[PDB]
DNA sequence: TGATCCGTCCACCTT
DNA sequence: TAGGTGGACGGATCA
């Protein structure tokens, strides 16, 4: 995500009841779930409970898994750290969780690259009605209709949309991509000293990062209060704004991520009680009757 | 002062009405008033003789409530302070790589004497000398905002005296001890975690972590032994609890080194044995000299005598 | 000037 | 994993 971005977008949130999501097709960004569940087979327990919450409220989810890591992201990570192996164990957990999904009759895909980018594309193609994720990157990838904190234990979830963000904060997609280069994200380290308050002020005052850069480099005398304090801060943090600021690579990474444009509509099956019974028995030692108590209310006649 | 110390002592503060201080003898720590008035009072640059205006207004407030002040000025800067501060600056520089005149001092002291108010110059730090005055019962309280006064053994402190309020914040060592479990040695050892004029403290140690260290280990020697013994004999780590395993991880990440200067006897000695005047001769308060105050304010600030009279006559 | 305010930074926690 | 949070940090302001 973009660092501190939810602090900025937070006031535009609209609480909606879980009951209002009935029959909605929802892209579920599941790229990060296995890591969050890292008692044997906690990934299964974790996926099971979240899947049940979605289906309990009649949501029609499509699960999206990460594909590759793009180069800019790999680089930015690398500069921040500056019988089976881990990969094999990961492969197995993903496979098991996907087996669980299919027994629930829930479709899933593996994005070519970032899951959130793919989620945004699913919504653009009207293959889903909304996106369930807590990763603010989704906005920069052109996402809207985002449902955040879906898995907190509250009666409501937070609904965000690109329209409200524009109307209320004056921010469009290019603005958010530029905010990322101040705040930092997976694709850029941002600027030292630039938090959500200073970053928003910069966009509001200078409109864009080019003007921001120009005001800075040219000036290095009749500057107002705001400009004077900001310049000293940039100086004090040894900020250099060269020909790579703003970054065309960052812009392209968010504006043109690798996604699948396939327009085949997703198909939802019904949960397979028999196969879920045996799966849960095998994986976690649940008696069938225990599985039934949770799962039978999910079975239409 | 000791960094964040008022955050720690704050909840023991008791609000006291200025009216209650009538006839109290009060050591006034005036060591940074001049520089403060220089920086706090400007035009559109320092306004002229703001040190006179500033001192005059504060003196009148004290006299208005019948306080019997004795003003204390700094003498020298202790070597340990000069060393601490210069090292602090050197290391901050090594991360990125309006003056007080003798006449200003003489002027405010002339003002003081025309008010008939006794003043002294401490051999070194004013706060240390204030604590000594109280210990010898030459005064009944100390007016200062600088937390160092507790470490120098000051026990009855009046903070925010010149804020625009009906009350002043009273602090005493006995309440700090009783309510926070902190004695003088504890406070001096807190300084070595938090930082003060006499030590740059430890990275990562704010008021929360520093209080925890003193509570859990009792003293810095015990803390050091715990850290160092466990860093060497890793076997001693296996049995330590959550707090200790988390604290250790933090100190390591912060590259903390606790050597033979930790705790520092130089720091302890500087607070326990500051250079102060031990004279037991009581102070004598005079009466304000209206004639000489009139001419002083006239000369220094252009105040017509009638302006001075309007303020000074009720005080006399 | 020392203390306070407030925006930011950092690492742990929860998931 | 990574958003949130608790605690620390630091520059600008208070007074
Ligand atoms: Ca992302
Ligand atoms: Ca001091
Ligand atoms: K930043
Ligand atoms: K510290």
Residue numbers in the entry:
A (entry chain B): 2 to 39, 50 to 93, 761 to 898, 905 to 985
B (entry chain A): 2 to 45, 48 to 100, 765 to 983
Task: Give sentences from the paper.
Complex II was solved at 2.1 Å resolution and comprised two protein molecules, each interacting with one ss/dsDNA junction. The substrate used for crystallization contained 14 complementary bases with two-thymine single-stranded overhangs in all four DNA ends. However, in the crystal a single T-T mismatch formed, resulting in a 15-mer duplex with 1 nt overhangs in one end of the duplex and 2 nt overhangs in the other. For the non-cleaved (3′ flap) DNA strand, in one protein molecule of complex II and three protein molecules of complex III, we observed the electron density for the phosphate group of the ss/dsDNA junction. Several charged residues line a pocket located close to this phosphate: Arg60, Arg61 (both from the N region), His830 and Glu831 (from I region). In complex II, Arg60 and potentially Arg61 (through a water molecule) stabilize the phosphate at the junction. The productive complexes II–IV have the same overall architecture. The relative orientation of the protein molecules is similar between complexes II and III but differs in complex IV. All eight independently determined protein structures in complexes II–IV are essentially identical, with pairwise root-mean-square deviations (rmsds) between 0.5 and 0.8 Å over 273 to 285 C-α atoms. When all of the protein subunits from the productive complexes II–IV are compared, the DNA superimposes very well at the H2TH module, but its trajectory differs significantly in other regions, particularly around the hydrophobic wedge.
Rad2/XPG belongs to the flap endonuclease family that encompasses various structure-specific nucleases involved in nucleic acid processing. The unique feature of Rad2/XPG is the recognition of DNA bubbles that comprise a stretch of unpaired bases flanked by double-stranded regions and correspond to the DNA in the NER pre-incision complex. We report four structures of the Rad2 catalytic core solved in four different space groups, three of which represent the productive substrate binding mode and reveal that the protein recognizes a single 5′ nucleotide of the single-stranded portion of the DNA and a 3′ phosphate group of the ss/dsDNA junction. The two critical regions for substrate binding are the H2TH module with a Rad2-specific α-helix 12b and the hydrophobic wedge that binds the first base pair of the double-stranded portion of the DNA.
